[PDB]
Amino acid sequence: SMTIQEIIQQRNIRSLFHFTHSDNLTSILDNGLMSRSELDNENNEYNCNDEERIDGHPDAICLSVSYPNAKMFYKYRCLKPGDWVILEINPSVLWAKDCAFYPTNAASNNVRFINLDLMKGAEAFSALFSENVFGIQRDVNLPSEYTTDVQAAILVFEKIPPSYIISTFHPNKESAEHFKRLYPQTIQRYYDNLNARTLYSQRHYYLG
């Protein structure tokens, strides 16, 4: 029945997110987001986080709806030193590009074996907001735009040109200003400190 667009409308979704290490941001702002396979095709340099990609979709770019995958992002920030950024991306990508919609992390046993063609389109997208996603329960007070499971993923099977990046969030002012001078036509945001509710927080904390 309902299209992806109408779900977005109804739920007040305004942001997809992609976390990446600042080391990557220049290349992403110049060339846009690309998959592992595509980065290797052109043998581009990149700083990656998940080596094996058990999701089995290295030709896909991983995004989140309305909030980062706080778990996996936190895990990755504990390993590699340095600044991490969060790209804010036009929700239009969900229909303008070939996307699969997973209601939890895509490498999960609960969804990894499902026929990929069944993960595309509005039915699959809608599954991200169920009351119960494999035992992960949606609080009645969770706002509409948030996935039930914070690790719900969008796998985007084509390049995302940099025009689809509506803003970038920085962990501090110096980072933002550095990239603003390099890319003055882009919006580069920052937090004073991370001792606040930020997109670097755990989601329950952020929304509490």
**Nearer Cβ to ligand NAD (6/98):** 98
88: left (phi over 0), alpha (psi -120 to 50) or beta: beta
Name the site residues for ligand NAD (rule: CB under 6 A).
17-20, 24, 27-28, 31, 33-34, 36, 39, 44, 46, 48-50, 53, 55, 62-64, 68-69, 72, 106-107, 153
**Nearer Cβ to ligand NAD (68/171):** 68
Helix (H) or strand (E) segment spanning residue 125: helix 122-127
Report in angstroms how near the CB of residue 15 gets to ligand NAD at its nearest. 12
Q: Is 22 exposed, middle or buried (0-12, 13-18, 19+ CB in 10 A)?
A: middle
* Residue 84 CA: distances (Å) to CA of 61, 78, 96, 185: 17, 11, 27, 21
**Nearer Cβ to ligand NAD (2/48):** 48
**Nearer Cβ to ligand NAD (37/132):** 37
> What whole-number distance in Å separates Cα of residue 59 and Cα of residue 86?
21
Report in angstroms how near the CB of residue 1 gets to ligand NAD at its nearest. 27
